[PDB]
Write a protein that binds this ligand. Sequence first.
Ligand SMILES: *[C@@H]1O[C@H](CO)[C@@H](O)[C@H](O)[C@H]1NC(C)=O
Ligand SMILES: *[C@@H]1O[C@H](CO)[C@@H](O)[C@H](O)[C@H]1NC(C)=O
Ligand SMILES: *[C@@H]1O[C@H](CO)[C@@H](O)[C@H](O)[C@H]1NC(C)=O
Ligand SMILES: *[C@@H]1O[C@H](CO)[C@@H](O)[C@H](O)[C@H]1NC(C)=O
Ligand SMILES: *[C@@H]1O[C@H](CO)[C@@H](O)[C@H](O)[C@H]1NC(C)=O
Lengths: 49, 297, 297, 49
Amino acid sequence: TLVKQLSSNFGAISSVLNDILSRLDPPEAEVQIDRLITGRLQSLQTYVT
Amino acid sequence: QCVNLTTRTQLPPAYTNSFTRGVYYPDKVFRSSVLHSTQDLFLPFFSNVTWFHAITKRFDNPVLPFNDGVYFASTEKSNIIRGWIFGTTLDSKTQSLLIVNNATNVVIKVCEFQFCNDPFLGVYYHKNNKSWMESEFRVYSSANNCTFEYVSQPFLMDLEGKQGNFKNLREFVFKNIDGYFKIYSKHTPINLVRDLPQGFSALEPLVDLPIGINITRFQTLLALHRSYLTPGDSSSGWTAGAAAYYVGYLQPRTFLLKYNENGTITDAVDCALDPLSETKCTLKSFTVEKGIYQTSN
Amino acid sequence: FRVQPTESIVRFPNITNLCPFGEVFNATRFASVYAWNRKRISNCVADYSVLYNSASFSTFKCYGVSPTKLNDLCFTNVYADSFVIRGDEVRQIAPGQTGKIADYNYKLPDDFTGCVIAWNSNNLDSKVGGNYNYLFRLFRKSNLKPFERDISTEIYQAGSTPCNGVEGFNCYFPLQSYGFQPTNGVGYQPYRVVVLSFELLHAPATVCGPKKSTNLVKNKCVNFNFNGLTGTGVLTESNKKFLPFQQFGRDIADTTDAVRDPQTLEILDITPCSFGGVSVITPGTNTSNQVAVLYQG
Amino acid sequence: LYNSASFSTFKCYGVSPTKLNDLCFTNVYADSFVIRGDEVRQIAPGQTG
Ligand SMILES: *[C@@H]1O[C@H](CO)[C@@H](O)[C@H](O)[C@H]1NC(C)=O
Ligand SMILES: *[C@@H]1O[C@H](CO)[C@@H](O)[C@H](O)[C@H]1NC(C)=O
Ligand SMILES: *[C@@H]1O[C@H](CO)[C@@H](O)[C@H](O)[C@H]1NC(C)=O
Ligand SMILES: *[C@@H]1O[C@H](CO)[C@@H](O)[C@H](O)[C@H]1NC(C)=O
Ligand SMILES: *[C@@H]1O[C@H](CO)[C@@H](O)[C@H](O)[C@H]1NC(C)=O
């Protein structure tokens, strides 16, 4: 389940970080980065608990 | 001009049951030894598939509705089935895709076609030389405007008026999504003609075309065999060979696909056919242990 | 611990065709908004250098992609939509915006991924007495779905009075002439607006950036770019068998582990470079200052 | 009133004539006068005479 949670969008345009980085400029990209960061951090917290 | 077929016997269409046939690769990705689950248009297992037969002077080219999708499977020996017409109005008022295979180049073009009431292909056996030629090509009348045309390489086949048992099984799936015409094909040798055999045969994609027209009706093209012992008229002497093709309709369904080591789809399981099938879909396994499980709400 | 990449490689298809931007932008006859024209572009290298130069371009807005990066990644099925709208309406042709023209004519999906290019037209699309060739719809029963066209010409029904041919009270034709004139203000001048839509839609890619392809190096931790796919891992020869239509590979985790080289059509595996972990052991600062380093993996 | 069709002219400016009861108004004011046949165009928004 931890590994499968890695593929979700969490609201970003794409799940893969590299696709977001290449397609979008830095100023616009960081929001899409923030979505993924929050989602993955929450998944890690759940697993640890 | 187009000759009109006459004196043809009309019979009610029979019904037969499919047996877990019609699974195709849904993507270009390669997977091995993975129980992947996908959601797309599929032919549900054990479905009610209409069965047509062509054989006194029994003939049938009904204009069947296209619906969301079509599973066209024809078992034949003499290749009496040649091509399919895909049009909405079928009266040269709207674009009508024409896929026809003949002795000449395979013709896959979209144009405004004034299709006649009976678009039947005709192959005549000549007496000057012992060869079969398509003396009749009066399927349509004219093609004023042609938006897109694609002519492939010529294909040669032995066309004869034989009533023997079918030698091969050909399966085709047609889908019209996002303006792209997708055709999946498979070719499996077969000898039994009673019904479709059991088993799973994955269909590999054949070709994709950007026709970009919406289709509501389609019609199959059946060749007519006229030998030197027959007058060759549409009234008499037009007796065609034995023909059997099955038409099924796709629906939105969820399948669980099994890939072996080489990447081929050996088996599949529906997720709405039975409670046991739903349980196997939930657990993502083909075997279920003793116990009690919660499938849905 | 980490292993750092040494070199970078790019593997793009070898395409010599150049996409005809001339027809798209510099067209003598330019379509109307009521019936917008769609052009399909494929199998050509697209140079977007001219686009960000902004030569005589009033508005250059890109959604979902950055114009500077447009000549890097690689796409499929470039669409071009041409239509003519009034000078104060170019703003409303944008994702998530509703307006009189947008609801009753060409509209953009909320998930649009493309660039909107607009430039002003002074008198090329204007007449001294008013250009009435261009038409727009101000009436419609139901708002259009994304990427829809209307060819119907019927009188709109208002109230209980029948319309669509029964002309009378509360019967107005939805189509109206724009009436462009060179004497009007800047906000009433016709503007030529072209919409580009970009989608991958499959593994194969047709329109690719003018970036040169370098040689191939194997068995070294390097940066690889296959048809716009960016990653970092060692590249080795692969024994995995791909069916001819298949182009990529995926594992259980769904990350790419194999890919086909576009130039040479050779299957090669991808393996991530080793990272591991570092642990340092000490007999104690009091006893000595020597340490031993353990690498986990 | 819209379906009555007893009015030679039934034009709504700034609001949809078909959907008028749907929208509530804080205050409604009515002005009444009878003019000639060549003066209806004069009584219109953006019209001067
Ligand atoms: C298919 O439907 C027909 C009625 O349309 C029915 O008579 C027939 O039994 C059905 N097929 C099967 C295998 O039950
Ligand atoms: C074929 O296209 C031309 C060009 O617009 C058109 O004038 C003609 O009417 C079309 N033919 C038919 C049968 O509509
Ligand atoms: C399909 O084509 C027919 C042609 O008569 C048209 O009436 C219908 O609106 C079309 N449907 C869609 C969804 O475009
Ligand atoms: C994969 O292909 C090889 C070579 O044809 C064959 O030996 C092997 O049995 C196949 N594996 C399957 C079909 O699972
Ligand atoms: C180191 O060991 C000696 C001997 O016991 C002791 O006197 C000294 O305080 C120790 N120093 C530290 C930093 O542990």
